[PDB]
């Protein structure tokens, strides 16, 4: 037969088990027969099977060395199959190893017929023109090899993501990717033509790769594979093995695309030919998490609001409409901050029911606190207009307005934009599909109402209540500034605006407690009465 290639380890690599494998490869190639060429190919495949079954000291090597060895082994297997392919007559050649390694070969004359080959692991529909070769005048050579336990060699493999592929993935996930963990599905490991120049195809070729299930039952009787449910943080790879100058080799996905997956199969279309395999690759991505600074600041604001609520609940001299409004505004702020601490973080998952509920209650607590501030302004207006006679406004109407107007707004918005609640990064509203206008509508309308109320109250007072109007205006400004800076903490790469948001929460709690409780004299007298 024709001269066989000498199989050598990669330079600088020492391994006794691999040397034992290559010595048998060389001796078999020395003693191979023309009628045993396809036997020689199967024997080489069985030697690969034994090498997998006896990993030895290969795993003790560096991963880049192991990947380089695996690339060399698959390349040599392609070379020896190509060499002995011309030694075989025309026709298909299909063999299954006792270690369940499938190899398909096919020899036909030159032509442009659409040829669909494959038995179990894969189905390759290719144009036969490229199988003949650009310069080879002999019969066309093409084949597919599938080996199941490259995990012996391809452990902790690396995936090189293309720049535009990274840009698309980060647009999909809306932040950076730490890395990729690779879990393959198929045993397909080699697709080759007659000539070695298969780096580019003038026409894409379709493949139907099936993924074997490692069942412990009788072989050949298993049903077709059940489809794996795709998760949020994972997408399906029609990948190939490409050598690398720095780490031996890596997985790559460019030039290939996914078309569908059913009956235990995945349909891929590729612009080139190489070692193809289907990966079920989970992407490791960091999730936006509140910093310790922000958590401590929110805890301090919660403490201040708790002191406020206890004071407004227990100090009996100060009971009134203003105290009721401050009580309920502090309650809404406390509940909103508690929900923010407990559920703004989305721990690297999809937008579930809990995340959507957290976004809904955050919006409700927002609108309720804002409407209770508006109620405080409205009662100041009513007090000034009636020239301080009184009777206020009943707490039942106050609780209807400040807890039902937000309920109506949130219910309507969640009935229209149910998909706009919760994001994969944080449990807060998403402003796509015109949700920004529908969210700023009620907010800007109540801002306009508050501004009208405050300017009318100031105008009426110009013709102790001016101090209350100033305090209400400053409190509204502080709450609005806190919320506005609470919307830009998620976007910013450098969390310097989170410092401002934390400081604004701290100042909001301190402002409420100082102005409404500490600077109050009846509150202090009640405090010393309790502490006596």
Ligand X SMILES: *[C@@H]1O[C@H](CO)[C@@H](O)[C@H](O)[C@H]1NC(C)=O
Residues that bind ligand X (CB under 6 A): 52, 55, 148-149, 152, 155-156, 181, 214, 224, 262-263
Which of 104, 28, 505, 52 lies closest to 301, judged by CA?
A: 505
Compare residues 5 and 234 and give the one whose CB is closer to ligand X: 234
Yes or no: say if 238 and 266 are a contact pair by the CB < 8 Å rule. yes
Compare residues 181 and 197 and give the one whose CB is closer to ligand X: 181
Which of 205, 215, 212 lies closest to 101, judged by CA?
A: 212
Yes or no: say if 161 and 231 are a contact pair by the CB < 8 Å rule. no
Compare residues 62 and 452 and give the one whose CB is closer to ligand X: 62
Give the shortest CB-168-to-ligand X separation in angstroms: 24
Euclidean distance between the first and the last CA atom of the chain, given in angstroms as a whole number:
108
DSSP 175: S
Separation between Cα atoms, residue 94 and residue 170, nearest integer Å: 43
Give the up-direction half-sphere exposure of residue 265: CA atoms within 13 A in the CB hemisphere.
Answer: 17
Compare residues 92 and 224 and give the one whose CB is closer to ligand X: 224
Query: In 10 A of CB 132, how many CB atoms?
Result: 22
Give the shortest CB-265-to-ligand X separation in angstroms: 9
Yes or no: say if 80 and 44 are a contact pair by the CB < 8 Å rule. yes
Give the shortest CB-158-to-ligand X separation in angstroms: 11
Give the shortest CB-45-to-ligand X separation in angstroms: 16
Three-class SS state of 186 = coil
Separation between Cα atoms, residue 521 and residue 531, nearest integer Å: 15
What is the tally of helices (H) and strands (E) in the chain?
13, 13
Burial of 107 (0-12, 13-18, 19+ CB in 10 A): buried
Give the shortest CB-157-to-ligand X separation in angstroms: 8
Q: How far, in whole angstroms, is CA 134 from its chain's centroid?
A: 44
Token digits of residue 497: 């605006």
Compare residues 211 and 322 and give the one whose CB is closer to ligand X: 211
**Helix (H) or strand (E) segment spanning residue 115:** strand 114-117
Compare residues 221 and 262 and give the one whose CB is closer to ligand X: 262
Compare residues 19 and 181 and give the one whose CB is closer to ligand X: 181
Give the shortest CB-270-to-ligand X separation in angstroms: 24
Give the shortest CB-262-to-ligand X separation in angstroms: 5
Compare residues 55 and 348 and give the one whose CB is closer to ligand X: 55
Give the shortest CB-51-to-ligand X separation in angstroms: 10
DSSP 226: P
| Rounded alpha-carbon distances, angstroms, from residue 397 to 325, 332, 375, 405, 456 | 11, 17, 10, 11, 22
Give the shortest CB-148-to-ligand X separation in angstroms: 6
Three-class SS state of 527 = helix
Give the shortest CB-221-to-ligand X separation in angstroms: 15
Separation between Cα atoms, residue 470 and residue 477, nearest integer Å: 11
For 247, residues 6+ apart whose C-beta sits below 8 A from its C-beta are: 63, 64, 67, 158
Compare residues 146 and 413 and give the one whose CB is closer to ligand X: 146
Compare residues 109 and 227 and give the one whose CB is closer to ligand X: 227
Give the shortest CB-29-to-ligand X separation in angstroms: 25
With tokens 């309790």, the residue in question is 530
Token digits of residue 444: 């800007």
Separation between Cα atoms, residue 343 and residue 335, nearest integer Å: 12
Compare residues 135 and 216 and give the one whose CB is closer to ligand X: 216
Three-class SS state of 209 = strand
Compare residues 189 and 337 and give the one whose CB is closer to ligand X: 189
């Amino acid at each position: 037969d024709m001269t066989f290639s000498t199989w050598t380890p990669p330079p600088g690599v020492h391994s006794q088990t691999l040397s034992r494998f290559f010595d048998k490869v060389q001796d078999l190639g020395r003693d191979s027969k023309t009628s045993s060429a396809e036997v020689t190919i199967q024997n080489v495949i069985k030697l690969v099977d034994e090498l997998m079954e006896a990993p030895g000291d290969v795993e003790a090597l560096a991963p880049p060395v192991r990947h380089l060895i695996a690339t060399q082994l698959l390349s040599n297997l392609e070379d020896i199959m190509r060499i002995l392919a011309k030694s075989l007559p025309k026709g298909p050649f299909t063999y299954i190893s006792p270690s369940n390694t499938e190899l398909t070969l096919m020899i036909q004359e030159r032509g442009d017929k659409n040829v669909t080959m494959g038995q179990s692991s894969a189905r390759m529909k290719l144009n036969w023109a490229v199988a003949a070769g650009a310069e080879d005048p002999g019969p066309a050579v093409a084949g597919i090899l599938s080996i199941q336990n490259m995990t012996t060699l391809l452990a902790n493999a690396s995936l090189n993501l293309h720049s535009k592929k990274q840009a698309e993935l980060e647009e999909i996930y809306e932040s950076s990717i730490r890395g990729v963990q690779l879990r393959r599905l198929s045993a397909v490991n080699s697709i080759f033509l007659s000539h070695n120049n298969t780096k580019e195809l003038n026409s894409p070729i379709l493949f139907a790769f099936s993924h074997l299930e490692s069942s412990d039952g009788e072989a050949g009787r298993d049903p077709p594979a059940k489809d794996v449910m795709p998760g949020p943080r994972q997408e399906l790879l029609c990948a190939f093995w490409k050598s690398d100058s720095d780490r031996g080799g890596h997985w790559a996905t460019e030039g290939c695309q996914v078309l569908g997956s059913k009956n235990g199969s995945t349909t891929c279309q590729c612009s080139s030919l190489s070692s193809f395999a289907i990966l079920m690759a989970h992407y490791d991505v960091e999730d936006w998490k509140l910093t310790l600074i922000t958590r401590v600041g929110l805890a301090l604001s919660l403490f201040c609001l708790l002191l406020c609520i206890l004071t407004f609940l227990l100090v009996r001299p100060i009971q009134g409409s203003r105290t009721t409004i401050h009580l309920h505004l502090c309650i809404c702020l406390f509940v909103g901050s508690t929900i923010f601490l407990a559920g703004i973080e989305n721990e690297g998952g999809q937008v579930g029911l809990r995340c959507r509920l957290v976004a809904g209650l955050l919006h409700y607590c927002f609108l309720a606190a804002f409407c209770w501030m508006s109620l405080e302004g409205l009662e100041l207006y009513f007090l000034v207009v009636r020239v301080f006679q009184g009777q206020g406004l009943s707490t039942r109407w106050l609780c209807l307005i400040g807890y039902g107007v937000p309920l109506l707004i949130v219910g309507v918005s969640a009935a229209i934009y149910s998909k706009g609640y919760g994001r994969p990064r944080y449990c807060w509203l998403d402003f796509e599909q015109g949700f920004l206008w529908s969210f700023l509508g009620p907010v800007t309308f109540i801002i306009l109402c508050n501004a009208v109320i405050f300017v009318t109250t100031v105008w009426k007072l110009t013709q102790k209540a001016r101090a209350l109007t100033i305090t209400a205006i400053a409190q509204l400004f502080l709450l609005g500034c806190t919320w506005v800076f609470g919307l830009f903490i998620f976007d910013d790469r450098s969390l310097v605006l989170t410092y401002v948001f934390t400081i604004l929460n701290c100042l909001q709690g301190a402002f409420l407690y100082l102005l409404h409780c500490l600077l109050n004299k009846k509150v202090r007298e009640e405090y010393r009465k309790w502490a006596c």
